[PDB]
Enzyme design. Structure first.
Site, PDB file in Angstrom:
ATOM      1  N   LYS A 288     128.817  72.341 129.101  1.00 20.72           N
ATOM      2  CA  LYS A 288     129.352  72.022 130.339  1.00 20.72           C
ATOM      3  C   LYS A 288     130.353  70.801 129.725  1.00 20.72           C
ATOM      4  O   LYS A 288     130.254  69.805 128.375  1.00 20.72           O
ATOM      5  CB  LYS A 288     127.907  70.824 130.990  1.00 20.72           C
TER       6      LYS A 288
ATOM      7  N   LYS B 114     126.699  70.474 126.211  1.00 23.32           N
ATOM      8  CA  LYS B 114     127.327  69.662 126.551  1.00 23.32           C
ATOM      9  C   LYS B 114     128.299  68.725 126.048  1.00 23.32           C
ATOM     10  O   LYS B 114     127.470  67.651 124.754  1.00 23.32           O
ATOM     11  CB  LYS B 114     126.305  68.672 127.097  1.00 23.32           C
TER      12      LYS B 114
END
Ligand SMILES: [Mg+2]
Ligand SMILES: [Mg+2]
Ligand SMILES: [Mg+2]
Ligand SMILES: [Mg+2]
Ligand SMILES: [Mg+2]
Ligand SMILES: [Mg+2]
Lengths: 319, 319, 319, 319, 319, 319
Positions: free
Chosen positions: B244, B191
């Site tokens: 992400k 992420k």
């Protein structure tokens, strides 16, 4: 730490992580056409398979396209067989005709025509025989003549299944010279000499096999050779490459996928098909479960297209 | 010789060789839950995206599963925020109550719960803040409790999105210690600290962001580090791993899928969602076309599961 | 043992270990030229984008070069459109003129000219249309004529974005025969048929699209095909290869990088650009943060050059 | 230039370069044992396949080894079934008694024993069922006892076919703990949930299958997961690893052999066996040809050991 | 956890897991023919080796084929040696004759003829010598003439062992032009200049070596060069590629296997053979154990075919 | 275009590009030690190879090091043999006394000691025999003592040649436990059961070989297993790894070097040595040429250290 079953605990998760799926667009439907009008014939060794007249071929394709099927593979059953197999490139043959008739009624269907001299010659081989020899370079010459005629008739694709050396190049050269550089070529790159082609001979009423085809068809023991074969074909211009047969050759399919980055086709031969039919008829297996699953396997092995006599039954199942 | 266009001449042909397709089983729907009864609020920066109360949320799920969507990502939005963020592991938290109601009303729906201290703390961070420092090991100790709590309520999966070091390991241990070895873990392995997260904060009533999460969230310039992170989590026990954001990080997704032989997940982040919303509202882009297409690109890159706010609009379209 | 956050604890360390950086030399600025004098036009679907007259084009380039920008991409907006698109190879066209005028005033700027028949034909396609067919080999012939004219005018590079088969080879053969074996060729190797080209049509006032371009432009679902496409192009002589679009195709960029060891270009299409513009206008995201970052991503994916309408704004930001 | 057919012109040439051959040392014969004395029952769905009593089974083995077959896979079929399936680890079980008699009569025959709770439980599952849940860790605890028991009777090898998580590890530990570090382990590393298992259930008097084994048996759509599973077992201590089923999973076998440098085993499952039986009985296929060929394909794919019901008919043919 | 010995505890297991096996079809038998009738000659430095008259050659081949041997390699011992080695392409030479006589009596035996000018020239080199120089391009010209004659005589394969540059291409071009595009070519791709060719010189009564052949034969120190050599040969059309010598060059064999996916041949030279003969004669080793085993090694290294003077003794041992 | 011979035209050129050379620093000399004073006995099956008493052995080493040879492999030959083979770890054993004297007289010589129970037991095996079974773990416990003992006397290195499971690990632990972490370990990682060992047994007065060592020594048909074995030992702590035998196992050596990034060692076994001795004695081969060449081949394959009985004759030649 690791518990793979975590990804199987439920159908939801299973549904989420599934690596591969089968779709209608993965299916191609073989079609056996014959001389005559208003008539279809059940194939003895292929329950559910049929010989269609052109007018009935058109009727079928109309149902096909509506069910989702995106293309078929035309096989031509001539009334007469010759030694020089010249009927192959007769523009008034059943095959050419069917090509014409079909393209007109269901123009949005990808017609793929079979290229080989087996249904047109009286010795059961896919090429010209001389003194017991299946003549290579001479056969391609006819194959070229043949292919061009399919294009002239309106063929979308041609699929040489002859396993003659360097036929993809010659054929491609001919299509180009006759303003057919847009007609694709699906080549049987890795076609093996197999005991799985049983029920198919009777299908098209092909002359007695008369000696194996192991002088051009591939040794089933061989893998490295399959890489040699495919590569040669891609270099020659083959748009798509196919492995035959399929069910028991999934390693040959996976290998072609990983190496060549060209679309990969596979054949669900009469034997694998007729085999599931006979076992189900005795109640030893599930026709539906076995048929579909074995198609899933072909998808997991890397195949993109699948020539299957179950094509129509699988399209209803996915409808 | 070669002519790639031969495979593009026709919808049929194009449909046959297409390397990837998108399905309903690729989609996971983020669900935002808030305290109260029978109410719903659209998100200002995420048109068509709303927060739900438990009652409203259960019904929504009913419509979800009916459409084929296999999973949801439960997001909690507590009434009060604290510095120790203890509510996160409260058995009666609004999140927990959502887990319990949903699993009951729609048991067949795989429930994935978000694990992070962001909505539960005043500092708008995913971990515990001491003196301008987002504590790692301390924060993880609160994440474990969170995960167990969620599992205790009937969660099928937890998705630590904190980007704390060694959190997957700790959590996997806690979960097993409390008899939850059947409860999987979906790890936000890679992420990044992106500016693609704007609209999302308001969705949950974020808090003084104060500084930035670039001490635990990854620098968007790095790829190698992403390989280090993933391998670390897979080694820890993560059943699945996620990238992400999504649209602009498809290279990280292809790299992931290509190297780790574990299920890969991507996130159609809020900033990506709103961006189509906005452009479409001006008539510069076709919203339905760009949305679906961008989902396809994520499939082409190697994503198996897609956390997207367009999930419901896709399931219909895919229906 | 391992704590990845150790490399993020500070901006210094973060600054030290950062794998990738964006620089002015990674940017190329598209320029839309039109007939007339002393005039520039705001593009409706592309806020910040403009149509320039030649005299204003020269003015811009002068600012460009001074800000660091190293090359641009010339698009030519003809006053009249024909079916045979012969204006493409008119040495007195706006494009050729602009080429001349620019090379003179800012000779140290790498001019790259767009090769395609879209702005010159009345059907919205990048090639010649006959009976609903975008004629392949006939279009290249014009493309050749076109390219040679750009060279004659003084073009540094040509960038065929037509996606016609084997046009890089033909074009390269023509440039050689006209003493232009030194003019480079930046080819749109993997150009997909995308819903991201929205705002661009209106930019150059191109004829109504009139049927998708999916008969030559690539299926967005496909990856392996991109490798097939690029390779063919490099073998034909392409100096640089480009992927289009860019933001949601970063996996195609990474793949081209890892395989071909030729310089790799990418396009920040109107849609990705116009998309960030619309979202920012509503306050849903940061124009600056989003624009730059998405450029960073393209750099991390492997791109060397980047055709971006933000090129000028990014060069000020890096100044 | 190239002409692959040059290597096919002649049986000699073909015999010289053939990449793979099948031998007697590739075959392992499944033996079904039942209680009683001097009796044998053919399996309805597996023609030529029979269940044996201990006496009859010992003699059969004599004929086996005489033909060169190196190993057998002992399958037990207890008199009574239970929910805790304790008989599995009873020192006097019909299975155990078979192990003891065989090793004595034909010591030179490698005895591999099946390890799973399927024939010993009423639910027709391979593990212990609690509340519609097939317990993993509990089931494994009963498998260990089973394995030791088998080793205690003189087994040379055990082949856990349960598909429980971490069973190879547990068992390997139990076996070592009881002084059986010389007793190898053949792991059904990648056993899928296939519809190719029909005829087999009746062979042993299966039980209310109740649901399906897709919570521990692998989805036939997945390949990556197969790499995860195998690597997990090899890490656990499995001496050999097997793929199941066989014919239609040759891609998994090639992948296995290609990556793990450990002996690889495949399973000519019942559904595959019967399918040739049926088709052959109709005269659609040559039973001996398809059988042997399909075995070859398994060798071509990378299989070293083949568990096949045709083992005896092959040893003769190979004789 | 791991105990490799588990797979060695018994001959059964050992027999099951064995990676490689040697078979008759892996053997090729060299044959030295000489002028005269009814006569065979023991070779001094090659105990068990012989020079055969044609009529005795036929007698041997008849025994060969019956023992399983699938092909031989014909060496021709001329009565007269010249400087221009024109006898090579004399259609009335011993070699051509033997070719004819053999093909007739045992037509199902793959005859492979040796191509080189050593037995035909008085300087002990495999090519034409001028001023101390082994003339490259001039030698091939004769080699071509030679090869075509072997084909005319009925040769199945030709095996140029000359190590002249680009002779496989020229020779292949000649065979094609004389309607011999079906005659294969087994090329000595990686033939090194070795001290292992001792006993062979005397075998065929070849002129005094007179200076090493290190100007064309390969440096034994080199490996990368072997890859350079083979590749060139395959590209030229070589059906099969061979390494020489064999026993101490197994790394060169393994490498050719892993890289080229063409059939790979190897030579058990006089030295390795005569070496095992002399050591056994003193009772220092086992003739049988050493001979066979070293053949096993060649099989494990990747060789498919093996030119061995033990060929006949190994075929009896495998009978 | 290409002409590899261009790099062979001249000794200069040939000397410049030669990929590998052999040096004195590649050689390790096996030394056989026996009880008694001032004596030496040539080995019947190994001409030029002798057994030495300690005094004679020390002097020999002096001549060794003087010639540049960097290391020796001490082989012990005890007066009396026992079933528990305890002499192996006797501080006053003839071996130990050799270690002590040598290190003193020639400290600069790296002393590697053989570790195995072969010369110390009556069964002529490398491990302890119970009931026709060569015990693994028991045998290893005696090997540890052996290794420590050798280290205690001043050994620089130990070379376990037993082929027992997990012996490198155990020994490395024992050595560290007794303050010998500076004492390396040279592991016979892949020692096959070869018939190339004939002459060696008499060298040390072997014993009732009784059966064969194919339960711990590797099958010469396998390569994959060799990769398993090596990786196992490297994981255990082996500083170096060896292949045995050598000449005919160069493919295993190339594979080793290619995959493990640790120093690789090969063994010019007795059977290889004698074989040149014999052939040379007949005048069929040039002993000096074949010997040196075969050493080269071992360098070409990837060997760093060569245990050869020709070590002294090479150091001179290399001098
Ligand atoms: Mg071919
Ligand atoms: Mg991390
Ligand atoms: Mg292209
Ligand atoms: Mg598993
Ligand atoms: Mg050469
Ligand atoms: Mg070992």
């Amino acid at each position: 730490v690791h518990r793979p079953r975590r990804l199987r605990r439920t159908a939801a998760l299973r549904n989420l992580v599934q690596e591969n799926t089968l779709t209608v667009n993965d299916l191609v439907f073989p079609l056996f056409v014959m001389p005559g009008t208003n008539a279809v014939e059940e194939v003895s060794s292929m329950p559910g398979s049929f010989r269609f007249t052109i007018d009935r071929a058109v009727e079928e394709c109309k149902e096909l396209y509506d069910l989702g099927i995106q293309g078929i593979d035309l096989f031509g059953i001539p009334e007469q067989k010759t030694e020089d197999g010249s009927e192959a490139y007769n523009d008034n043959g059943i095959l050419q005709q069917a090509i014409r008739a079909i393209k007109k009624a269901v123009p949005e269907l990808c017609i793929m025509t079979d290229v080989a001299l087996d249904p047109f010659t009286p010795f059961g081989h896919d090429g010209l025989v001389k003194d017991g020899i299946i003549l290579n370079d001479e056969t391609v010459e006819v194959l070229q003549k043949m292919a061009v005629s399919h294009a002239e008739a309106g063929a979308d694709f041609v699929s040489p299944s002859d396993m003659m050396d360097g036929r993809i190049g010659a054929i491609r050269e001919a299509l180009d010279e006759t303003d057919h550089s847009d007609v694709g070529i699906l080549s049987y790159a890795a076609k093996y000499a197999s005991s799985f082609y049983g029920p198919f001979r009777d299908a098209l009423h092909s002359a007695p096999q008369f000696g194996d085809k192991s002088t051009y068809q591939m040794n089933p023991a061989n893998t490295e050779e399959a890489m040699k074969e495919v590569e040669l074909d891609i270099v020659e211009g083959a748009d798509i490459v196919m492995v035959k047969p399929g069910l028991a050759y999934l390693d040959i399919v996976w290998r072609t996928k990983e190496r060549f980055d060209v679309p990969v086709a596979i054949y669900h031969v009469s034997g694998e098909y007729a085999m599931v039919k006979a076992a189900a008829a005795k109640g030893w297996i599930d026709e539906d479960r076995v048929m579909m699953e074995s198609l899933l396997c072909m998808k997991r092995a890397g195949a993109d297209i699948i020539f299957t006599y179950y094509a129509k039954e699988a399209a209803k199942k996915l409808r």
